[PDB]
Design a binder for this molecule. Sequence first.
Ligand code: ZN
Lengths: 434, 126, 102, 49, 171, 121, 134
Amino acid sequence: DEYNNFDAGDLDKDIIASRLKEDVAEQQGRVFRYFGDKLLISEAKQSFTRVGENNLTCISCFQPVRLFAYTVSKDLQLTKYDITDFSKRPKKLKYAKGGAKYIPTSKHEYENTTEGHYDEILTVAASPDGKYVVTGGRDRKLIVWSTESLSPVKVIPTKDRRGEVLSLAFRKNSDQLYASCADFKIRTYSINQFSQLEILYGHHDIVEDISALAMERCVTVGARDRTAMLWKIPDETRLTFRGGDEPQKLLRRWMKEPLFFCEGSIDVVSMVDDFHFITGSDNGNICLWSLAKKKPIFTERIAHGILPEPSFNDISGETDEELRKRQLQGKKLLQPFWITSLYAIPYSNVFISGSWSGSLKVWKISDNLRSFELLGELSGAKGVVTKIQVVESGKHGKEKFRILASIAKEHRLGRWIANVSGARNGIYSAVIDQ
Amino acid sequence: QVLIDTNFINFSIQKKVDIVRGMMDCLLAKCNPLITDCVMAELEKLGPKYRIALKLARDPRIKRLSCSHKGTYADDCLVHRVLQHKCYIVATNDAGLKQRIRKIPGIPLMSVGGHAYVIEKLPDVF
Amino acid sequence: AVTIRTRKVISNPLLARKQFVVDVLHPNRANVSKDELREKLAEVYKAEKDAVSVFGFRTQFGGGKSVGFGLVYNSVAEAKKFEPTYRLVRYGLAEKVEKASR
Amino acid sequence: SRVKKRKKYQKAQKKLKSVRAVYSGGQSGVYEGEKTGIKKGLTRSVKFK
Amino acid sequence: YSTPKRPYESSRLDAELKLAGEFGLKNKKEIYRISFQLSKIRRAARDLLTRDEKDPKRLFEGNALIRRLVRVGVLSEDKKKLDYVLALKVEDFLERRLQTQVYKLGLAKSVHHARVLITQRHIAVGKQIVNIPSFMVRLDSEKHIDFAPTSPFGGARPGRVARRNAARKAE
Amino acid sequence: NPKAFPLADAALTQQILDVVQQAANLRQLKKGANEATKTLNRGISEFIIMAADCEPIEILLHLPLLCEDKNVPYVFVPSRVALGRACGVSRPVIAASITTNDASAIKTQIYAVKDKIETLL
Amino acid sequence: FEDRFDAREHKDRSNKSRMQAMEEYIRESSDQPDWSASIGADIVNHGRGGIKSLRDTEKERRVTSFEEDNFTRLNITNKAEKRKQKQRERNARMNVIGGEDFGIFSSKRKLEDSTSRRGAKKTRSAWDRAQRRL
RNA sequence: UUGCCGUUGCUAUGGC
Ligand SMILES: [Zn+2]
């Protein structure tokens, strides 16, 4: 570096970059709420309210800048909850059941403007101004309900025969919704204007999970392509982040002197700032990813442990224990609890991971943003975690959070899930503090 | 898999086209040039005026079949094992063998013409 | 319905103006409908409807979006003073005709 | 000029069942029989040399 | 494009008959266009083989050529050698066109049904409705060939024949 | 030697499961145990994917007998829940078969996996 | 002798040693992702073009960013377009198959003789090669 | 704390 190091073009662009407007939504702010070790762990108030609905599916919450959450079930029922009382269970405000009354009388695609659901409402999203909630599922519709009445004020179809929506995310502090349809599509809607802005294509299996933050960017992940993409929606472009853990070379890394293996399906995302995200995979991987690297920065190989081995009384039907124990092939058929719900508090140091391992796991990323660590475990949620999110209260130095998570006995998309070891269906609420 | 005979070898040496590189240049593919034992016996019988051709046919890259029939008549050996199987290319320059091979169907035919090889009954050369 | 999106809003007070680029998103519509779009821009900002103008409309292949150049004013007086005559005879209120001869 | 070559190919793979015996796709259902005759005099195989 | 050396031999006439009938092509100029650029491609791969190992030309242009052939789709993921580029041939290149790919993906009952679907604008790969059948869809665009959103075989309104029949059955 | 003998390890398992999902998307897949034996004795089958951890194992050990009869490759995949997820259904399947189609956009994938498990066997 | 100002002696030419083979290898082994588009929006005349080339989409990004940066639609300047646009579409439809160009493998340009084998730091002494290695 | 049924708290759990 010399004494003269100016470029005429660059000082011109900084003149224009001073002259412009909108230093508002484009905040490329990294993690600033560095509170990973500051809060406690082992004294969270774990209140599990068991609710009377088979197979809840997702939770949308709300904070302004009273407080309500929302739930949605496989029994075609949305139910609104007050959660503004921070130390008790949520309370039921309005149920809302769809069913056979709202199957259309036409069986044709454009006139799917029936005012309710009839099959498997999959995700829900409450507006940042709270006026509306939106929810959708395998009835190829998005239904927008009012807050104060829970009426469908608009029904927008996805308009094709495989238009199952599978994840919804409002971008923060705006009225724009990104819904990740199983047509390898992302549809964007303006909810105060009731319009569709952009459809945008590009995944290779069904776009199972979506997440958004303060900017117009988005992060989506598809099931078995094992890639996670992020989208610039004004520029309509994307970055693709493949996986890339080879079990043979990880065996070689241990064989320098071990049940870790390949990758099936990336399941869940949550965007942690405007420069990183975390993806939860099918072999229990949790991976932390930059914006400047294809391959992930950090991988946690197994995050929720390994499924119990199949019983010798239920493996073959031979008479002797020796041959029934022979038919397990040793460790060859042990499979892990796949991380199936992942959530980040925005711009924070902590995140939450959940499956049917029975215990949620709170983790904190390191300060340098190159690794993460288990903080603690939350052993009050028996069952599959179909959604995790966090509600906050209190100012910057002292704050108190309640993890609202939904627990069912079956996965949110297909069933596939046996060995219900005493699981129940309801809302887990863990109030952690400081 | 390109079955060569003796006047293909002699014409390639008289034109200075290499065997494997000339076949790769002609077909734009890969080639296994093959010398049957009767073609090799015909080259050895042709005398010591053809020692150059003999030790250019003894090449490591040129693989070699082993024909099991009495005597050393290369044209009947090539015609029999080519109408047997329909998977070979016949590389030759005999007028008689070229007329036999271009009368039987589905057998391509390579020949030294000009200053590199030409190929006749193969319909995908470009 | 027709939705609008402003980008790269800069302020040019030397011409007493604020200029920007407009993404016009119309699903299954014909095209932008420049007048109705100017009313929508007059509503989404402070009003100044006869002071706002958009001129650089380019649709894309297959419809869906269009990209244009919007420029909102204050003070319709300087809108007349600075916005040129061809745009004013398109949209606004100046009109000039020429003695075509030779 | 496309539906010409659509049909002079359907003629072409109908003439091909007269020279060769073209692989149809395997046994349809139950095996009924040969349906066209068994000739015990004719042997259609390639003798060697 | 350019005609072959011997264009009228009976082997080549049966070749063109079989390719046109199997892939639903219109004339010989599709085969000659595709085979012209394929001749250029494996003419390049031949010279990249005629220079030996460790050469900057062979190394960089070889990995460039096989990676962009995989990305076009005519090569597989696991043949990353510069001799499968020589083993390439014409029907690998015209198995990738949108007409064949619609027929394979089951949006039509024939290759000619696929051809008329594409030229009557019911097939849209990604966003754009494609009208031409000779498209060479790539490996990434392979899975997003689907019926257009403006198409009565997709989710849109019936066409003029069906809704004129609805009008005539209304009167 | 256990009863579910050619158990495909991690790489071959996700390879198999990717071609199973693509065949189910293109309607070339027939899923279930007695559907698999129906298509195995019918003849529309390239290769057949059984699970290695169903609740008994002999419920689908009835299949490799038909496979060695009719020269069809068979592979035990280590999770029936994963195989149901791959097939794309809402219940864990234990056996699936890839029906023979020639107009198929995934023939090279099906054939590469078939050759790999023929080497495995 | 004496000093003369020369923009061609401190000008960003930077195109005498860009080769698509080398940039393709750098993009493969970069480990930074590459901003691909949504998969439909890249084909052009409903397919009647190509998809479009990488040089085409970077040039198009430059034209629309210059467009959104100083507010000006371009023109139909006929000599310029009658050469460059018809020659551009003709080399595109001859060489670019499936959105990937293949003319770089059928054109004579020596890769080592402009792109590798550095010229100033040629290390023309054994002491220099030992020092620069260590 | 709900579809029910039970232990109930005078609030937690467990079986479908
Ligand atoms: Zn012989």
